[PDB]
Amino acid sequence: ARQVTIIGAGLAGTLVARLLARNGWQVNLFERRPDPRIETGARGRSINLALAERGAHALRLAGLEREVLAEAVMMRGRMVHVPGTPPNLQPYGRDDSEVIWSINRDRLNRILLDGAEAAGASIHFNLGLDSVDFARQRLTLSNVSGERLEKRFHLLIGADGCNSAVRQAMASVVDLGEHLETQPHGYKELQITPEASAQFNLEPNALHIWPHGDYMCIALPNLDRSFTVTLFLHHQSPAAQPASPSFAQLVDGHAARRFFQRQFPDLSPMLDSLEQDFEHHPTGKLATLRLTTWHVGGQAVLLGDAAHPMVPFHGQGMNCALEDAVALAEHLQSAADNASALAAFTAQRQPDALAIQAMALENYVEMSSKVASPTYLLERELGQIMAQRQPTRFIPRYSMVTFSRLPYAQAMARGQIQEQLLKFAVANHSDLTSINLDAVEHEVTRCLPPL
Numbered sequence: 423a424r425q426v427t428i429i430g431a432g433l434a435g436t437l438v439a440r441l442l443a444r445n446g447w448q449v450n451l452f453e454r455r456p457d458p459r460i461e462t463g464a465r466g467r468s469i470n471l472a473l474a475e476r477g478a479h480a481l482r483l484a485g486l487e488r489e490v491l492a493e494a495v496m497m498r499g500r501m502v503h504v505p506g507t508p509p510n511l512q513p514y515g516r517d518d519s520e521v522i523w524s525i526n527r528d529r530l531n532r533i534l535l536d537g538a539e540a541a542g543a544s545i546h547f548n549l550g551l552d553s554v555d556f557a558r559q560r561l562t563l564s565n566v567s568g569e570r571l572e573k574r575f576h577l578l579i580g581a582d583g584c585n586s587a588v589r590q591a592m593a594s595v596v597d598l599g600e601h602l603e604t605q606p607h608g609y610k611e612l613q614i615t616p617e618a619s620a621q622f623n624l625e626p627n628a629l630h631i632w633p634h635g636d637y638m639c640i641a642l643p644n645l646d647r648s649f650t651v652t653l654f655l656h657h658q659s660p661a662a663q664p665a666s667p668s669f670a671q672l673v674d675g676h677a678a679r680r681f682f683q684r685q686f687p688d689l690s691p692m693l694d695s696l697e698q699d700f701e702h703h704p705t706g707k708l709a710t711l712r713l714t715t716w717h718v719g720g721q722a723v724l725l726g727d728a729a730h731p732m733v734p735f736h737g738q739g740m741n742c743a744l745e746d747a748v749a750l751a752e753h754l755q756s757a758a759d760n761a762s763a764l765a766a767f768t769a770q771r772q773p774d775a776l777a778i779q780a781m782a783l784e785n786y787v788e789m790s791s792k793v794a795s796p797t798y799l800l801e802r803e804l805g806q807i808m809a810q811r812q813p814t815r816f817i818p819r820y821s822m823v824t825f826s827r828l829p830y831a832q833a834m835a836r837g838q839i840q841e842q843l844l845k846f847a848v849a850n851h852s853d854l855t856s857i858n859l860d861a862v863e864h865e866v867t868r869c870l871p872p873l
């Protein structure tokens with residue numbers, strides 16, 4: 423049996439562990455955190471994640487989808503809260519079968535942990551990777567107290583998150599060609615209690631958006647009718663716009679409350695613990711880190727956030743991470759050797775990672791800056807018309823990334839053709855009546871091969 427060592431029992435690591443273990447691999451998985459299935463007296467604070475077709479399919483191949491969806495809240499559409507109009511529900515896709523699932527991060531991790539152990543993988547918690555000696559095929563682990571433990575390894579899988587230790591150790595033997603691109607937006611995670619959401623009639627079966635240009639909020643529901651709310655806001659105010667809102671201006675909960683009362687008046691009543699959550703939770707940072715290569719020979723390979731950290735604006739980090747796990751397991755299982763597997767895995771997935779990394783950055787301007795634009799509404803109306811006339815040619819880019827498994831590079835390449843197509847057809851036209859629908863349909867068939 424081929425042996426594999428996996429660092430990080432996160433989402434990608436536990437999935438790939440399951441897939442290799444049921445294929446007969448001797449799988450050992452190391453995790454720095456304690457086992458979350460051991461119940462303690464601590465009050466865990468977990469957030470919800472948007473599970474889409476890519477992630478759902480990855481769980482389907484692993485035999486875990488039914489179990490995960492049983493604990494997920496169905497989101498049938500996007501609930502846009504734009505001032506001046508009532509909350510507007512925008513259904514997903516074309517039919518009632520296209521939905522996104524809101525799954526609690528902790529619930530999902532437990533299901534994957536159980537899933538990996540049932541396939542035969544061994545999971546070792548409370549052990550963080552410190553360094554790798556690639557020459558001697560050894561690594562060093564330690565607990566929080568710093569007691570060191572050495573282990574032999576044949577194949578090392580880095581599934582240890584944005585701040586991957588496998589990635590850092592790989593940087594000693596190969597130039598990964600890393601380019602960190604930091605994001606000026608930070609995020610703050612707030613809570614809406616079940617009582618609060620019910621009191622203000624917040625739809626449980628929808629994903630909510632409060633667009634506001636350079637800042638915004640999103641909310642995803644949990645099984646108990648609570649919601650986890652993410653505020654996206656500039657870390658600092660630029661000198662060009664010194665009075666623009668930023669986290670630096672929100673020094674306490676009293677400032678945060680006045681900010682929300684003025685800029686999110688319908689959302690602020692639902693934030694019972696806005697003052698407490700604002701000062702007791704850290705302001706998270708966002709970044710896009712790109713790598714030229716993801717592997718060292720047949721010795722080590724990165725996947726998930728370890729290989730391609732991205733901004734969460736498209737809700738696709740986990741989905742891409744689960745998709746990575748399937749591809750990595752497929753290549754490892756069927757290749758002539760580990761080095762051929764790892765080189766082929768990188769070649770297949772690296773272009774798609776750069777694509778979803780790019781599309782995630784663009785999608786912030788789409789959901790927070792465009793959903794209230796007059797030109798964008800006409801382009802969106804015309805794009806929906808093309809999705810019905812050519813259902814296999816004009817698939818809106820959000821549907822391709824979210825509701826299909828088309829490679830991220832194809833979705834971005836087809837999306838730029840559609841974006842430019844809508845841009846030129848709507849240009850210099852006020853109403854949809856002055857737009858020639860059949861000329862737009864002709865260019866759809868000319869430039870977009872059917873799927």
Ligand SMILES: Cc1cc2nc3c(=O)[nH]c(=O)nc-3n(C[C@H](O)[C@H](O)[C@H](O)COP(=O)(O)OP(=O)(O)OC[C@H]3O[C@@H](n4cnc5c(N)ncnc54)[C@H](O)[C@@H]3O)c2cc1C
Pocket residue numbers: 429430431432433434435452453454455470471472473549550551552581582583584585586587609652725726727728734736737738739740741742743
């Ligand atoms: C605010 C926010 C919202 C998001 N929302 C969504 C969403 O709606 N949909 C979506 O698809 N994605 C979303 N994402 C992205 C998603 O959470 C991540 O992309 C996903 O968790 C990546 O999975 P992974 O297994 O690669 O890493 P992780 O899931 O982070 O797992 C990494 C694991 O490695 C462990 N580890 C780290 N260092 C070490 C070490 N040195 N030794 C041992 N173990 C180690 C960690 O403890 C952890 O268990 C969001 C991200 C953020 C920040």
